């Protein structure tokens, strides 16, 4: 199984419109765009992000899939964003939908924001924190915080883990891979997603730290 680069929208105006929905949602939350992990003051240094600290180990991203990741990042940088649209929904808040076809195994985005110790975030009200590193020593555990800086990943919806039929809404998956010895969090399509289809993944895919009883 190999990661696939996304196919960005052929129409330049369509890519502009897409990028604009993300810009609007970021501006709405008073956030700055960041397509990388940021290591801020009074938070975690880049040195703290070391994959050998993962309790039980972390799978390594292969050379083939790293080139795929770099290819997607270069595309984002040049202007070829993934074919995603940020759309406000009254029942979910901001959501992400496919604004083009996304085949199975296609790289969607990296989960970005500020990396901080879980110990500095135990009572943080941010509705979008994501576990980065789960260390044996709980003072070494890290969390991604897209409260001030972040990308599209933080707007992607989750499934209700309590309903009999909610698992059916899941069309993408959040995995953690080792890249140059560091922890990285990625989103990948788990099935062929059509234009307009809402992206959903399991927020409780390893731990069960996110309350989903009320999700739609």
């Amino acid at each position: 199984r190999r990661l696939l680069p996304f196919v960005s929208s052929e129409d330049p105006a369509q890519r502009l419109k897409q990028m604009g929905t993300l810009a609007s949602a970021l501006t709405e939350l008073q956030m700055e765009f960041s397509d990388d992990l940021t290591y801020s003051s009074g938070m975690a240094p880049r040195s703290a992000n070391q994959a050998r600290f993962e309790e039980g180990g972390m799978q390594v991203l292969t050379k083939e899939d790293i080139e795929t990741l770099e290819q997607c990042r270069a595309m984002c940088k040049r202007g070829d964003c993934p074919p995603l649209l940020v759309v406000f929904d009254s029942r979910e808040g901001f959501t992400v939908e496919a604004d083009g076809q996304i085949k199975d195994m296609t790289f969607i985005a990296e989960y970005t924001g500020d990396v901080d110790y879980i110990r500095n975030r135990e009572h943080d009200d941010c509705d979008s924190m994501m576990t980065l590193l789960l260390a044996k020593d709980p003072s070494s555990s890290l969390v991604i915080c897209p409260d001030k800086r972040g990308n599209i990943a933080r707007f992607i919806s989750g499934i209700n883990n309590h309903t009999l039929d909610a698992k059916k809404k899941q069309n993408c998956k959040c995995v953690r891979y080792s890249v140059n010895g560091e922890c990285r969090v990625f989103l990948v399509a788990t099935r062929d997603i059509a234009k307009g289809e809402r992206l959903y993944y399991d927020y409780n895919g390893y731990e069960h730290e996110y309350p989903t009883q009320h999700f739609v």
Partner: peptide
């Protein structure tokens, strides 16, 4: 009064599929 903190988590083994 009591302060609680929601966190997403992802597997670090098993690949995508």
């Amino acid at each position: 009064q009591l302060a609680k903190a929601a966190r997403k988590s992802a597997p670090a083994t098993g690949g995508v599929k």
